[PDB]
Structure 1
């Protein structure tokens, strides 16, 4: 139960370069503005082999439940319909999303008391930092 360190309730405190990430992904103007304002709460839980990541915000709510290494269907906050696979590599959750011939990778890691979310599309990276709620 190493995934233990992720479990909890988390609140966004900072975001860097996320507009550029969203642009690279294909998000349109109005969604970038509204999504970029949001300060979501993320709730991570584990029950047996199933991990659940729920995000609640003023903009959209999202929820994914998955088993590591097992592809699943996901609806993203920006309404992409993707095929997702999440693995644990050296204590980092690595989440690859595939859609329309494109790919993006989201890494989630624990650093000090924070949960750091790094979103990468092509050469663009963004960092989102969460603290315990």
Structure 2
């Protein structure tokens, strides 16, 4: 179900990421470096466990989860959240909850590119990844 998302992906476009980070309370210096960073995202499965790595010259993260099963997560900006990832309309939807707040990280495939839409508050960021061979 999740197989077309699997592999290694490289950031090739970013819109409104500063808006998104600022909504989350990320400090100006972190936003400044992040705005010039191009992460690599690696999505792997082993049975129904998915592992999603984000690698960069600035911050690295890694999460493992089962679709539809809540997990604890500590984000790149150091939020401690309750998370769930599910498939919805063919999109990989990651919902994070903390302190009554929520953010969604939605991944979809369009013309072979991986489009990540990040929403928090009114901020909507779109980041595009292309697949590495």
TM-score, normalised to structure 1, is: 0.95
Deviation at 1:107, TM superposition (A): 0.2
| Equivalent position of 2:116 in the other structure | 117
Structure 1 residue runs of 5 or longer lacking an equivalent are: none
**Quick one: distance in 2 between partners of 1:89 and 1:19?**
27
| Equivalent position of 1:131 in the other structure | 130
**Quick one: distance in 1 between partners of 2:110 and 2:64?**
23
Runs of 4+ aligned structure 1 residues displaced above 6 Å come to none
Deviation at 1:122, TM superposition (A): 1.8
Alignment of 1:13-52 (within 5 A): 13-52=12-51
2:94 is equivalent to residue 95 of structure 1: yes
Structure 2 residue runs of 5 or longer lacking an equivalent are: none
**Residue-pair matches, total:** 132
TM-score, normalised to structure 2, is: 0.95
Q: RMSD across aligned C-alpha pairs, in angstroms?
A: 0.9
| Equivalent position of 1:57 in the other structure | 56
Q: SS at 1:5's partner residue?
A: helix
